[PDB]
Amino acid sequence: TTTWIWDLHADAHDFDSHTTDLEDISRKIFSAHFGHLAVIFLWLSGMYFHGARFSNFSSWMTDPIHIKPSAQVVWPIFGQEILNADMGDGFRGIQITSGLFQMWRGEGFTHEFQLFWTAIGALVMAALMMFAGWFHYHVRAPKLDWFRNWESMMNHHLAGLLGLGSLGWAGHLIHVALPTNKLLDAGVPLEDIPLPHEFILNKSLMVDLYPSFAEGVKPFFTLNWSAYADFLTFKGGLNPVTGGLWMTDIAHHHVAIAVLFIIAGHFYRTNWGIGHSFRELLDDARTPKMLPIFNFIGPVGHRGLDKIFETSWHANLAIHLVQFGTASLLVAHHMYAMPPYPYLATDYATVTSLFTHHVWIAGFCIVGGAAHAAIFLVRDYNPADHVNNVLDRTLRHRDTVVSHLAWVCQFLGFHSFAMYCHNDTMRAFGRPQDMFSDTGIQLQPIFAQWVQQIQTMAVGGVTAPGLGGPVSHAFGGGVVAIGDKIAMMPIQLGTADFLIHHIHAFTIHVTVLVLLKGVLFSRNSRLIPDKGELGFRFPCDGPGRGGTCQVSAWDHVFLGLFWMYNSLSIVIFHFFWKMQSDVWGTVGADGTISHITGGNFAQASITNNGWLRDFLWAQASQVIGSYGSALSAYGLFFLAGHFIFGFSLMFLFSGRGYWQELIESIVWAHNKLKITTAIQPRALSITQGRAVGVAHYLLGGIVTTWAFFLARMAAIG
Amino acid sequence: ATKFPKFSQDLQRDPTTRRLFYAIATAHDFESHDGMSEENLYQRIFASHFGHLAIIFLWISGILFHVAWQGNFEQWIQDPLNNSPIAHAIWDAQFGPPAIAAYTQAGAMNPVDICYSGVYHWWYTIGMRTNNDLFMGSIFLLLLSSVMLYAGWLHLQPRFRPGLAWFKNAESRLNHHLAGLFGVSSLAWTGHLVHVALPESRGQHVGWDNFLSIRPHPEGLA
Amino acid sequence: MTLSETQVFVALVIALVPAILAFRLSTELYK
Amino acid sequence: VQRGSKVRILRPESYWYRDIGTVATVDQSGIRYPAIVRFDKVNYYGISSNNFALSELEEVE
Amino acid sequence: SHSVKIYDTCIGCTQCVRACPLDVLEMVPWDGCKAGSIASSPRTEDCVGCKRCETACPTDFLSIRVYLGAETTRSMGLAY
Amino acid sequence: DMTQLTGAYAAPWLPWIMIPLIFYILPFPIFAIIFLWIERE
Amino acid sequence: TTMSALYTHHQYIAGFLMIGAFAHGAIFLIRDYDPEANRDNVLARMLAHKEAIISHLSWVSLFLGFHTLGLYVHNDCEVALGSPEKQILIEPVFAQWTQAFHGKALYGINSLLSNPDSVASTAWPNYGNVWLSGWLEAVNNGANSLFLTIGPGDLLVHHAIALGLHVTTLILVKGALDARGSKLMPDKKDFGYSFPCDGPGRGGTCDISAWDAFYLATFWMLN
Ligand code: CLA
Ligand code: CLA
Ligand code: CLA
Ligand SMILES: CCCCCCCCCCCCO[C@@H]1O[C@H](CO)[C@@H](O[C@H]2O[C@H](CO)[C@@H](O)[C@H](O)[C@H]2O)[C@H](O)[C@H]1O
Ligand code: SF4
Ligand code: SF4
C-alpha cells in the first residue's frame, strides 16, 4: 500500500526502532554527526563563494552606508530578471538580509579572493567530514566506554572546543581584525589597507596603531597586563563611525571567556585523581545534604539520574535542543541591542531578519527538546532506576504541576489579552480615560524601568567603574547615529510594553503547558493507564471513554508547534513594531528624531484594532504594492504563504475516513479503464494527516511573515 | 437519575456534563424520543409548526413596532434618496459621549441604528405612509401570532388532534395549498395592490375607514 | 409623528396575550 | 468447490465483493464457513484470506 | 452501556479476548468453527468502547462489533 | 442630548428600565430557574 | 448598502438550505429508506451507480480547480513580473451571446432579440409582446443592474463558483450515497447518521459518518 512509502521516510533516522544495541546505535550517531557537519561546511562554502563571485562586496566595502548588500544574481529567463534590483553602485541583484557583509567586514575581509579561499577551505573541510564519518564508522568505530566518558568529553569541549576556539579567535581579532577595522574606521581606502599577514611580518606596522605591541608578549608573562590596555579595553557603547561594538572590547571579551572556559575544562576528573566526578555530584544532591529550603526533594534526590546519561541518547538531545533554544534566544536579544558588527544596526532589513531568524530557530529547538523528552520517558526510561528520586517524584505530583500551570495560564490570559479587549471596547465607546494606557489607567512596568535605571547608573559608576559608555544604548545613555540613521537609542517602556510582555508570558506558559502535560502523561494517565505501551506516536485509543483522540505524547508536540508559532509570531511582531516606532528612524538636520512609524506603538498597540490597522493593514502596503517591481517575489510569496495556510486546514479539520471512502470511487474509475497499479491507493494515516497539516500551517504562516517583513524593510528600511 | 431530559431515558442516567449538551442537540429529533408513536410524531410536528409561525409573526410585528416607535418613517418618505432609514434606538449605558454623538445620526435626536434590511422601501411601495399605519399592522400581527399559538395548543387537545390519515392526505393538501395558500393569497394580494397600494402611490389615501367608498378604478368593476 | 405613550402601553398590554398563549403552548408541547 | 478453483465472492459486506480469489482449503467437518479463499489484493487491515460459505461463491475455473 | 455483538463468522482465534483491556470478552465452546470456540461478551457493562477487539479481529468483515450506547461512569472511563 | 443616553420617542424611560431588566437583572434568576430544572431528580 | 445586505443575506440562507437538503436526504437513506419497497427503481439505481456519480463529480471538481487556479496563478506571475498583457484573458463568449439573446446590443452581434426585425422580437403571429419596448430600456441602460457587462475577470470567477458548487455537491452526494455503507464500513446504517468514527483500526476511520460529510461541506458551502 501507499502507507509504506510514507512510513519508510518517517522510520529513517530513529535508530532504536531497529535492533536496539547501544554501542551500534552510538556509532551510527557519531558518524551521522560528521555528515551533518559536512552539510554545514557545504552551505558555508556556498555563502562564501556567492560572496566571492556573485556580489557587490568590494563596492559595499568602499561606502557601506549608501550601498545595499547583494549576494544573489538571477538569470534572465521567464522575465524573472526584474528581481535584480539596483543596490546602488550599478550592481543589479537581490538585496540579501543575512548580514554576511557586516560579518565579513568585522572579521577582517577586504577582497573577493579572501572569501574565495574561505570557500575552498569549507569545500575541503566538508570532504574531511565525510571521510571522518566513513572512517569512524566503516573502519575504526569507537566502543561504548569511549562514548560514556562524560568527564573527558566535558573537559575537552570546555577547554578544547570553546576555550581554544575563542582564544584562537582572539588571536585573529588581535593580529588581523583589530588593525584592519582600526584603519577602516579612520578613513583609509581599500588599496592602502595592508593584507592581513603584513600586520605580523611587518611588526612595526601594528606599533603605530597600538604602541603596546613594541613591548611584546613580555607583559603577559609578568602579569603587567595593564600595559596592553589599548587593544583590550573595557569600553562599552558603540563605535560612532560604524555603530557596531568596539573591536577592542570584542578582543578582550574573547580573551576573558577563553581563560574562563579553559579553567572550566579542568573541573572534571578523567585520569589523574584531580577533579569532580559526575556521579559524586549527583549522588550528593539530596537530603540531608541540600539546603533546608530544598528538603522537599527527598532522601534520594539526584542519585539515580546518572543511569539516564549512560543509556539514553534521547534524554541528552532533549537538554541540548533546549539550550540551543536558550543560546539562539540570547543571540536574538543581544545582537539587536548590542550590535556586534560594523554598519549592522542601521541596516534595518538585516536587524529585522537576524532577530526573526534566531527567534524561530530557538522555538523549533525548544519544541524538539520537549519532543525528545517524551521519547525518553516512553522508550528509554526504566522505573527501577528511579525510585523516590527527582524524576520519580515529578511523575508522582504531575497532577499538581499541570493543574497549577493550567491556572496560571488562565490568569495570564485574562490579565493580558482580555485587557486588550477591555481597551478595544473602551476606545470604541469613546472612553480613552478608561483604557489601560499611558494616558488612561497606567500599568507602568516599574521593575523593568528600575533595571534600566540600574544598568545606566552602573557605568557612570556605582557598580562597574571600568566602563566609559553603557553596555547597551537600549538601557540608557544617548542616541547613536550612523549616516543620519539611528543605530540604537534608549527604549522607553510604558503601558504598551507592560501589556505585550505579559502576552509573551502568557503564550510561553501555555506552550509549556501543552508540552509538559505531554511529557508528564506520556506513559500513563487516569484515562489511558497503558499509554506508554501504545508508544510515543499513535493516533488514539478509539472513540471510547468519551473519545481519546490526541492522547499520545506525539500529538502534544503537534499541538505545541501551533502554540510555539502563536507565541513567537507575537514576539517578532512586538520587535518589528517597537523598533520601527521607538528606535529606528532619522535624526534630522534640526536635531529631532523622526521614527519610521512615528511613535505610534504607545497608543495603538494597546488594542487588537490597532494591531490590525496600524501594524497589519498599514505596514503590508509594501508587500501588496510590490507587483511589477523588484520586490514582486515577496508579493508572490505573501500570497503563496496565504495559500498553504488555508491548504493546511484541509488536513487539520478533516479525517481520513472520509478520504478513504472518497478514494474507492476513484479506484473504481481507474479499474474500469484497466489502468490499475499494484501499490494500493490509501489515504494518509491519522498521524500523517496531522503531520502534514501542522507542517503546511507553519510553512504558510512563517513565509507570509517573512515576505511581509522583508518587502517592507527592503523598501523603507 | 435526573428528570431532564424527559425524552431520553439514557440521557437521564448520564452522570456527566455530556447529558446537558446532548439534550439540547436531540431535543427536536422527535423520532428518536422515548416511546414516540408514529402518529404522535405528526401531531407534535404540526403544533411545533404553529409555534414557528407565531415566532415569525412576532418578529415582523417587532420590526413594525420599533420603526413606528423609534424610526423615522414619516420623515424618510419625504425624500427617500436624501434620508436614511432608522432601525431602532440604542440604549447602551456603557457609551461615552463620542459614541453617543456618533450614533445620533440620520436626523435623529438619540443614538440610533441605520436600517439596512429594506423594510422602509417595502412598506412604502405597498402603501404604508404613517406611523399609525405601521402600529396597527404591528398590533394585527401581535394578534395573528396569538392565533397561531392558540391553534398549536388547540390541535394538541384530544378532540382536535388530527389522525394519521389526515396527515398522509397528499391530495387534499396539494390541492388546498396550490389554490388557497398560493392562489387565494396571491389573489388577495392583488386586491391589496389595486385597492390600497396603487392609490397611495398616486396620492390617494385608502384606509379601513374609506375603502368601501373609493373604487380602485373610475370605471368601477363593470 | 411617531407613536404616543398610550400607543406604546396598548402594545405592551396586548403582547401579554401571546405571552400567555406561548406559555400554554410550551407546557402543552411538553416539559 | 474444492482446492484449485478460482471463485468469485457474492458477499456484500466483504472487501473482495465481485473480485476473484483462489481457494486454499475447503473443510469437510461441517462448520459454517468452510471455504478458505486466499486473495491477491489485501484489505484495509492486512488480511488477504478469509473463510466463506459455499453458497456465497461462484466458480470461474 | 455499550453493545458488543459477536457474529457467527468467528474463527475462535481468542485475539479479541487478549486485546480487551477491561476483560469484557471470554471464550465459550461453540462447535461452529474449526477451533471449537467462539467469543462472548458477558461483562459488557465494563466495556469502555476502545474497539481494541475490532482492531485484533482477523475476520473480514469483523466478527466482533462494538456499538457505543448510553454513557455511564464506567463506559466514560472516569476515575473521578 | 450628546452627553448621555436620551430618547426623543414616546416613553423614553422604557429602555432606561428594560435593558437593565432584560440583560443584567433577570438573567441570573432565569439561569437559576433553568439550573434547578435540569438538576432535579 | 441595503442591496449588498439583501443579496448576501438570501444567498447565505440559500446555501444553508441547500446543504440541509442533502443532510436530510442522507438521514432518509439511513432511517426511512426501504431497499425492498424501492427495488430496481431510481433510488436503487444511484445507490448502485454511486461509484460512477462520485467519480464523475470528482473529475469536474479536479478539472475546474486545476485550470481556474492555474489561470489565476499564471496571471499573478505575469502581473508581478511586469508583463500584465501576457495574462490569459479568455473572453466569456457564451454568456455574452446569452446577453445578446436577451436584448443587449452592447456587443454588436445583432441577432435574435438583439435584432429589430427578429421573429422573437416582433412576435410575428401576435405582435402582442407589450413587455418588450419597456424591457429594452432596462437592458440597454448603463445605470441599472440587470445583465451587467462581463469580461475575462467575470469568466474566471464563474468557473471558481462552478468549482465551489461541484465540490460542495461532491461532499454531500458522497456523504449521502455512502451513508448506508462503504467498503471501509459496510454496516454503517446500523450506527446512525452521526457517530464519531469506527476507531483507529482498518487504517483509521476519522470523519466517516454521513454527518461528518455535512460538517465538511459546510466549510465548502461558506467558501
Ligand atoms: C579538544 C578536543 C576536541 C574538540 C575540538 C572536539 C570537538 C567536537 N566534538 Mg568532541 N570529543 C572529544 C574531544 C574534542 N571534541 C573527546 C576527547 C571525546 C571522547 C570523550 C569526544 C567525544 C565526542 C562525541 C561522541 C561527539 C563529539 C562531537 C564534537 C563536535 C561537537 C558538535 C559540533 O558540531 O561542534 C560544533 C563545531 C564547531 C564549533 C566547529 C569546530 C570543529 C572542527 C570543524 C572539528 C574538526 C577540526 C579539528 C579536528 C579540531 C581542532 C583540533 C586541531 C587543531 C588539532 C565538535 C567537532 C560530536 C560530533 O558532532 O561528532 C562529529 C559528537 O557526537 N565529541
Ligand atoms: C538535533 C536535532 C534533532 C535530531 C538529531 C532529531 C532526531 C530524531 N527525531 Mg526529532 N525533533 C527535532 C530535532 C531533532 N530530531 C526538532 C527541532 C523537533 C520539533 C519539530 C523534533 C520533533 C520530533 C518529533 C515529533 C519526532 C521526532 C523524531 C526523531 C527521530 C526520527 C527522525 C525521522 O525519522 O525524521 C526524518 C525526517 C523527515 C521525515 C523530514 C520531515 C521534516 C519536515 C516535515 C520537512 C522540512 C520542512 C522544510 C524545512 C520546509 C521547506 C519546504 C519546501 C522544501 C517545500 C530522530 C531520532 C520522531 C521519532 O520517531 O521519535 C521516536 C518523531 O516522531 N522529532
Ligand atoms: C386553502 C386552505 C389552506 C391554507 C391557506 C393552508 C396553509 C398552510 N398550511 Mg395547510 N392544510 C390544508 C389547507 C390549507 N393550508 C388542508 C386541507 C390539509 C389537510 C390535507 C393541510 C395540512 C397541513 C399540514 C400537515 C401542515 C400545513 C401547513 C400550512 C402552512 C404552511 C407553512 C407556511 O406558513 O407557509 C406559507 C407559504 C406561503 C404564504 C407561500 C410561499 C410561497 C413561496 C415560498 C414564496 C412566494 C411569496 C413571495 C414571492 C414572497 C413575498 C414575501 C415578502 C415580500 C415578505 C400554511 C399556513 C404546515 C404548518 O405550518 O402548520 C402550522 C403544516 O405542517 N397544512
Ligand atoms: C499580570 C498583571 C496583573 C495586572 C492587573 C491589572 C488590574 C487592573 C490594574 C489597575 C490597578 C492600577 O491602576 C492604577 O489606578 C489608578 C487609579 O485609577 C490610576 O490613576 C490614574 O487614573 C485615574 C483616573 O481617574 C486618576 O484618578 C489618577 O490621577 C491617575 O494617576 C493609575 O494609572 C493606575 O496605575
Ligand atoms: S470495545 Fe474495548 S473494552 Fe469493549 S470489548 Fe472491545 S476491547 Fe474490550
Ligand atoms: S476520530 Fe479518529 S483519532 Fe478520534 S478516536 Fe476516532 S479514529 Fe481515533
Side-chain angles (χ1 to χ4, degrees):
Chain A
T1 58
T2 44
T3 315
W4 173 88
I5 297 172
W6 308 115
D7 285 331
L8 165 66
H9 293 91
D11 267 1
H13 296 159
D14 54 329
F15 294 157
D16 53 354
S17 289
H18 325 299
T19 74
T20 313
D21 171 352
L22 192 56
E23 180 176 279
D24 276 54
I25 275 167
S26 302
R27 284 157 173 189
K28 300 187 271 192
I29 289 162
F30 186 56
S31 71
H33 289 181
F34 282 113
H36 192 269
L37 285 180
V39 169
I40 297 183
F41 273 130
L42 212 59
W43 164 80
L44 275 187
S45 178
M47 307 303 106
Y48 277 95
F49 189 80
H50 286 247
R53 285 302 188 256
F54 300 110
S55 19
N56 59 343
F57 175 71
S58 56
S59 298
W60 178 89
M61 279 283 295
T62 58
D63 85 71
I65 292 176
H66 309 265
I67 298 306
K68 301 289 200 62
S70 175
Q72 182 188 328
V73 220
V74 181
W75 287 333
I77 59 159
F78 305 98
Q80 81 187 10
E81 76 278 347
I82 190 148
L83 309 173
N84 289 312
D86 211 75
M87 308 275 106
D89 73 270
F91 190 78
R92 294 198 71 89
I94 283 187
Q95 186 190 342
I96 55 149
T97 68
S98 52
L100 291 173
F101 284 14
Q102 295 95 321
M103 187 184 66
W104 293 338
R105 180 171 177 107
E107 285 169 340
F109 285 105
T110 47
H111 309 272
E112 280 162 52
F113 68 92
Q114 310 180 320
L115 301 171
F116 186 80
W117 286 102
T118 318
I120 300 296
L123 211 68
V124 158
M125 261 254 244
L128 205 60
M129 287 306 170
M130 200 174 283
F131 185 73
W134 175 84
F135 185 77
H136 286 302
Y137 187 69
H138 287 277
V139 173
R140 268 192 202 260
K143 68 188 259 301
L144 199 43
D145 73 282
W146 182 86
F147 288 100
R148 286 198 168 126
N149 215 324
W150 313 309
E151 284 92 345
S152 178
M153 204 185 289
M154 277 297 303
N155 271 358
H156 276 89
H157 287 166
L158 286 181
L161 173 64
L162 302 173
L164 295 200
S166 75
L167 179 73
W169 182 246
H172 183 91
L173 285 168
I174 279 162
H175 299 285
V176 162
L178 284 176
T180 317
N181 276 112
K182 187 176 191 284
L183 280 141
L184 276 181
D185 297 347
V188 175
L190 276 80
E191 334 51 291
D192 297 343
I193 283 332
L195 280 173
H197 54 282
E198 268 85 2
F199 305 115
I200 302 182
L201 295 177
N202 191 348
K203 187 196 182 169
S204 103
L205 206 151
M206 261 192 84
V207 170
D208 339 34
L209 309 159
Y210 301 99
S212 197
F213 272 66
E215 159 160 333
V217 309
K218 279 78 181 172
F220 168 64
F221 294 116
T222 71
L223 301 182
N224 191 200
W225 285 356
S226 70
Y228 295 142
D230 60 306
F231 64 99
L232 317 167
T233 323
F234 205 76
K235 275 164 104 164
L238 302 177
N239 202 341
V241 181
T242 59
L245 294 171
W246 284 110
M247 298 286 300
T248 71
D249 310 347
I250 296 175
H252 195 202
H253 175 80
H254 286 102
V255 159
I257 68 192
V259 178
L260 206 49
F261 280 147
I262 292 163
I263 279 180
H266 291 78
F267 178 81
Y268 295 100
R269 171 199 317 148
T270 59
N271 271 344
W272 287 287
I274 45 153
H276 307 250
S277 80
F278 266 113
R279 292 165 203 274
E280 281 157 7
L281 281 176
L282 289 166
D283 295 340
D284 200 66
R286 50 182 176 95
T287 66
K289 309 305 202 73
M290 303 273 279
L291 287 182
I293 185 58
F294 305 125
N295 278 141
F296 59 92
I297 76 154
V300 189
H302 294 70
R303 208 186 306 208
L305 291 180
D306 63 278
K307 297 171 274 202
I308 285 171
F309 299 89
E310 266 161 346
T311 54
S312 180
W313 277 100
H314 282 283
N316 280 282
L317 185 56
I319 308 174
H320 299 175
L321 279 173
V322 158
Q323 297 302 322
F324 268 108
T326 304
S328 176
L329 275 165
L330 284 174
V331 163
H333 275 289
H334 291 182
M335 286 186 51
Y336 87 87
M338 293 160 307
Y341 291 121
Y343 307 106
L344 178 87
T346 50
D347 190 4
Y348 294 157
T350 294
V351 175
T352 303
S353 292
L354 281 180
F355 184 88
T356 310
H357 175 86
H358 285 106
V359 158
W360 279 121
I361 290 311
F364 278 105
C365 283
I366 286 166
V367 173
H372 291 270
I375 296 156
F376 154 75
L377 272 187
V378 168
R379 278 151 165 236
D380 284 68
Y381 160 78
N382 180 24
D385 303 346
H386 310 283
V387 185
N388 214 25
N389 71 335
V390 286
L391 183 52
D392 180 64
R393 292 160 81 98
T394 302
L395 300 164
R396 286 200 274 119
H397 76 303
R398 54 180 183 183
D399 285 277
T400 117
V401 173
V402 168
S403 81
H404 274 76
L405 192 40
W407 166 75
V408 76
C409 290
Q410 292 165 65
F411 168 77
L412 281 159
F414 279 131
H415 297 77
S416 57
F417 168 74
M419 305 176 82
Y420 284 76
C421 298
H422 172 104
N423 273 4
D424 274 285
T425 318
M426 275 316 131
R427 190 169 266 164
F429 281 147
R431 303 157 56 178
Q433 81 276 354
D434 293 325
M435 301 178 70
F436 297 110
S437 55
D438 279 331
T439 59
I441 304 173
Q442 299 184 47
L443 310 163
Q444 286 307 314
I446 56 157
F447 298 126
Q449 284 156 356
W450 185 61
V451 167
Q452 258 174 351
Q453 268 170 42
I454 286 165
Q455 295 311 134
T456 303
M457 284 190 163
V459 299
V462 65
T463 61
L467 298 97
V471 190
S472 177
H473 284 274
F475 282 141
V479 172
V480 173
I482 315 294
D484 294 359
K485 287 184 70 76
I486 315 294
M488 186 39 68
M489 59 178 304
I491 309 185
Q492 305 180 237
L493 309 166
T495 307
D497 298 276
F498 179 91
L499 287 165
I500 192 74
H501 267 87
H502 283 83
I503 290 284
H504 296 336
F506 163 63
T507 61
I508 288 165
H509 270 83
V510 182
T511 316
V512 174
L513 171 68
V514 183
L515 294 175
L516 182 59
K517 155 199 198 296
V519 173
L520 288 180
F521 288 95
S522 54
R523 302 184 60 84
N524 41 21
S525 72
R526 280 172 166 97
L527 195 66
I528 321 290
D530 49 46
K531 199 198 284 185
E533 296 328 302
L534 304 172
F536 163 71
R537 171 166 87 253
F538 60 93
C540 58
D541 203 33
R545 318 167 181 92
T548 58
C549 316
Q550 290 167 11
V551 285
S552 81
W554 191 96
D555 312 323
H556 290 69
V557 183
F558 156 76
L559 296 185
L561 279 162
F562 290 105
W563 259 104
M564 179 266 303
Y565 166 78
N566 187 58
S567 181
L568 301 200
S569 295
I570 307 298
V571 163
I572 66 188
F573 280 0
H574 173 212
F575 180 81
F576 198 48
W577 201 354
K578 181 86 181 183
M579 293 312 272
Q580 283 169 113
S581 175
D582 298 82
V583 179
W584 298 338
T586 305
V587 255
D590 296 330
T592 61
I593 293 151
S594 105
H595 293 109
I596 292 181
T597 67
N600 60 346
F601 189 85
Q603 275 312 302
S605 72
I606 54 180
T607 63
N608 299 278
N609 197 30
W611 278 95
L612 180 80
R613 170 197 68 245
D614 280 319
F615 181 75
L616 278 197
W617 181 91
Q619 304 187 17
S621 14
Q622 276 83 46
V623 76
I624 68 191
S626 64
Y627 267 38
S629 83
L631 299 186
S632 57
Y634 294 124
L636 287 164
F637 271 52
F638 192 69
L639 293 196
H642 271 88
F643 181 84
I644 305 184
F645 161 81
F647 187 73
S648 71
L649 314 171
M650 180 159 55
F651 296 91
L652 297 166
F653 296 173
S654 75
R656 75 170 308 278
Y658 171 84
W659 297 102
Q660 196 53 65
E661 317 187 296
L662 185 56
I663 275 167
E664 2 172 46
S665 306
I666 284 94
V667 169
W668 175 90
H670 279 78
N671 284 309
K672 280 287 244 219
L673 296 158
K674 311 234 195 28
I675 46 173
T676 178
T677 174
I679 295 178
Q680 219 189 23
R682 293 287 188 264
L684 309 166
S685 70
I686 309 165
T687 347
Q688 277 158 204
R690 288 164 187 166
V692 166
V694 71
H696 289 69
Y697 197 109
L698 297 203
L699 179 69
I702 287 167
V703 163
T704 303
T705 306
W706 175 90
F708 156 67
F709 273 15
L710 265 69
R712 170 164 186 86
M713 280 293 113
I716 75 178
Chain B
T2 61
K3 293 294 179 174
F4 184 77
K6 88 170 304 171
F7 50 84
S8 172
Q9 288 274 108
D10 290 294
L11 276 182
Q12 287 172 26
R13 309 192 163 120
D14 197 316
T16 66
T17 53
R18 199 198 76 116
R19 157 179 84 92
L20 309 170
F21 286 122
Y22 271 60
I24 294 171
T26 64
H28 300 161
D29 195 15
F30 298 150
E31 301 175 36
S32 338
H33 292 172
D34 284 341
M36 180 68 65
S37 58
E38 193 263 330
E39 197 273 332
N40 211 308
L41 164 73
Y42 276 83
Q43 298 172 335
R44 290 179 99 252
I45 289 165
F46 193 49
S48 292
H49 286 184
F50 279 112
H52 192 269
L53 279 181
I55 287 166
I56 288 181
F57 291 140
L58 279 176
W59 161 72
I60 182 57
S61 166
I63 296 155
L64 283 147
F65 177 73
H66 280 280
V67 172
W69 181 29
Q70 295 159 342
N72 60 340
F73 178 72
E74 288 183 22
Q75 290 86 247
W76 177 85
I77 59 158
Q78 297 296 21
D79 198 332
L81 298 180
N82 292 165
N83 280 105
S84 185
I86 286 174
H88 48 88
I90 298 160
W91 200 273
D92 194 344
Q94 306 158 134
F95 267 35
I100 290 158
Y103 288 99
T104 316
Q105 52 190 326
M109 318 305 301
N110 51 76
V112 286
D113 296 299
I114 299 306
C115 184
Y116 296 117
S117 50
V119 297
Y120 277 56
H121 307 77
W122 169 42
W123 300 333
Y124 181 53
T125 311
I126 69 182
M128 301 291 219
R129 290 296 179 275
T130 69
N131 294 309
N132 280 236
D133 296 359
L134 311 172
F135 173 67
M136 57 85 66
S138 172
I139 289 295
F140 173 64
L141 291 159
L142 204 62
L143 296 166
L144 182 60
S145 92
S146 66
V147 159
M148 295 287 115
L149 296 160
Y150 193 85
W153 174 89
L154 183 66
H155 287 300
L156 280 183
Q157 300 314 289
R159 199 157 89 262
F160 303 91
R161 269 172 181 255
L164 185 69
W166 180 91
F167 281 105
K168 301 257 183 157
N169 203 341
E171 285 80 347
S172 187
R173 185 161 80 228
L174 196 65
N175 280 324
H176 278 88
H177 284 182
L178 273 182
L181 184 56
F182 277 59
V184 158
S185 298
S186 180
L187 186 75
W189 181 242
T190 307
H192 181 89
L193 283 189
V194 303
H195 286 243
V196 183
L198 269 163
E200 297 263 20
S201 175
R202 302 159 162 163
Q204 177 56 257
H205 152 66
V206 179
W208 292 110
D209 42 9
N210 71 102
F211 80 110
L212 295 178
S213 303
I214 295 187
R215 314 183 156 189
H217 208 277
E219 307 160 1
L221 193 64
Chain C
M1 74 296 293
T2 74
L3 291 189
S4 147
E5 239 178 316
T6 191
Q7 268 171 313
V8 168
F9 295 161
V10 159
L12 283 160
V13 163
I14 287 181
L16 296 166
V17 169
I20 284 153
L21 281 153
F23 188 83
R24 73 196 260 170
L25 177 53
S26 59
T27 54
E28 200 56 48
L29 266 168
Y30 274 133
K31 172 257 187 184
Chain D
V1 180
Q2 68 269 22
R3 160 171 196 120
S5 175
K6 298 188 188 300
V7 292
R8 200 225 314 215
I9 310 302
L10 301 182
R11 201 201 281 196
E13 208 169 317
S14 178
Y15 180 89
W16 301 276
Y17 185 41
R18 211 186 163 171
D19 286 330
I20 308 301
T22 297
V23 163
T25 59
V26 174
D27 204 39
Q28 266 336 335
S29 152
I31 66 172
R32 317 166 65 138
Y33 297 95
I36 299 211
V37 182
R38 227 177 293 177
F39 293 99
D40 288 24
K41 320 187 332 182
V42 74
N43 74 337
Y44 284 131
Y45 44 98
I47 302 306
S48 48
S49 147
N50 159 232
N51 301 22
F52 300 93
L54 263 59
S55 334
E56 17 201 350
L57 306 173
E58 295 265 325
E59 274 185 341
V60 173
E61 187 264 342
Chain E
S1 292
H2 306 320
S3 294
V4 185
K5 300 287 183 296
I6 291 94
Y7 295 92
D8 53 297
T9 47
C10 168
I11 65 177
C13 68
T14 72
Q15 271 179 330
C16 57
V17 176
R18 289 162 146 82
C20 182
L22 269 299
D23 187 269
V24 178
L25 314 159
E26 62 186 25
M27 304 300 290
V28 292
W30 184 32
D31 305 328
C33 65
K34 190 178 167 236
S37 181
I38 201 181
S40 52
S41 62
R43 300 162 295 274
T44 195
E45 85 291 328
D46 297 333
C47 175
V48 297
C50 65
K51 296 172 169 278
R52 279 194 215 181
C53 47
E54 299 175 337
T55 312
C57 193
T59 300
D60 187 332
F61 196 58
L62 310 165
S63 301
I64 176 154
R65 287 306 263 158
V66 185
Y67 302 92
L68 300 191
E71 296 310 314
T72 69
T73 305
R74 289 186 204 164
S75 82
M76 288 291 282
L78 299 187
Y80 53 91
Chain F
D1 187 77
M2 292 304 173
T3 64
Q4 66 186 51
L5 284 176
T6 65
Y9 39 85
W13 57 270
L14 268 173
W16 188 98
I17 197 54
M18 280 316 295
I19 282 91
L21 278 186
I22 288 314
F23 286 108
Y24 55 70
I25 290 162
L26 269 65
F28 291 170
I30 293 313
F31 293 152
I33 283 162
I34 290 168
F35 172 76
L36 294 174
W37 173 53
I38 61 151
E39 295 308 318
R40 100 204 185 275
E41 305 180 281
Chain G
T1 319
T2 293
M3 299 296 270
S4 331
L6 277 173
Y7 183 81
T8 313
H9 174 82
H10 283 117
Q11 281 285 70
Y12 269 94
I13 289 299
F16 265 115
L17 307 164
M18 274 322 288
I19 68 180
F22 283 93
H24 282 280
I27 299 153
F28 150 77
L29 285 169
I30 294 155
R31 293 184 166 177
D32 299 48
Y33 175 71
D34 190 283
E36 273 356 299
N38 302 0
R39 47 195 202 278
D40 209 19
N41 73 335
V42 188
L43 286 181
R45 291 316 166 108
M46 344 185 232
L47 296 178
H49 285 324
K50 69 173 170 93
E51 289 94 354
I53 296 177
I54 293 161
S55 83
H56 272 83
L57 266 165
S58 299
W59 177 83
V60 180
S61 289
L62 290 167
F63 174 78
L64 282 173
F66 277 149
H67 287 87
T68 305
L69 178 68
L71 280 188
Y72 267 123
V73 172
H74 174 90
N75 295 351
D76 275 315
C77 297
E78 288 317 303
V79 171
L81 265 54
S83 298
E85 64 65 31
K86 293 192 181 30
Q87 283 181 112
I88 302 176
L89 308 176
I90 312 175
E91 197 77 48
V93 306
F94 294 140
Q96 273 159 356
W97 277 59
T98 313
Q99 261 175 8
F101 296 152
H102 288 97
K104 284 182 73 74
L106 187 144
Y107 311 108
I109 57 175
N110 202 149
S111 174
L112 295 162
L113 201 74
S114 174
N115 202 341
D117 59 2
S118 173
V119 72
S121 302
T122 54
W124 160 71
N126 281 78
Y127 285 99
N129 45 335
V130 194
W131 72 81
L132 187 53
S133 106
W135 165 259
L136 297 180
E137 304 228 358
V139 222
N140 309 304
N141 147 43
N144 61 308
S145 188
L146 61 88
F147 298 117
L148 300 161
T149 298
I150 50 174
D154 296 81
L155 173 134
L156 292 164
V157 62
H158 264 89
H159 279 84
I161 284 167
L163 161 71
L165 290 191
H166 275 93
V167 180
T168 317
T169 305
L170 162 69
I171 307 151
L172 284 168
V173 165
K174 180 261 175 194
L177 298 190
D178 292 298
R180 306 180 54 81
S182 299
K183 153 176 335 218
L184 185 50
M185 198 174 173
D187 56 334
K188 207 188 301 183
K189 54 178 191 53
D190 325 55
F191 284 79
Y193 177 60
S194 179
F195 58 92
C197 62
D198 211 18
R202 319 200 301 278
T205 47
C206 315
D207 292 274
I208 202 181
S209 88
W211 188 96
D212 318 277
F214 151 82
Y215 151 82
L216 288 177
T218 313
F219 296 106
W220 257 99
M221 186 271 300
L222 290 167
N223 176 69

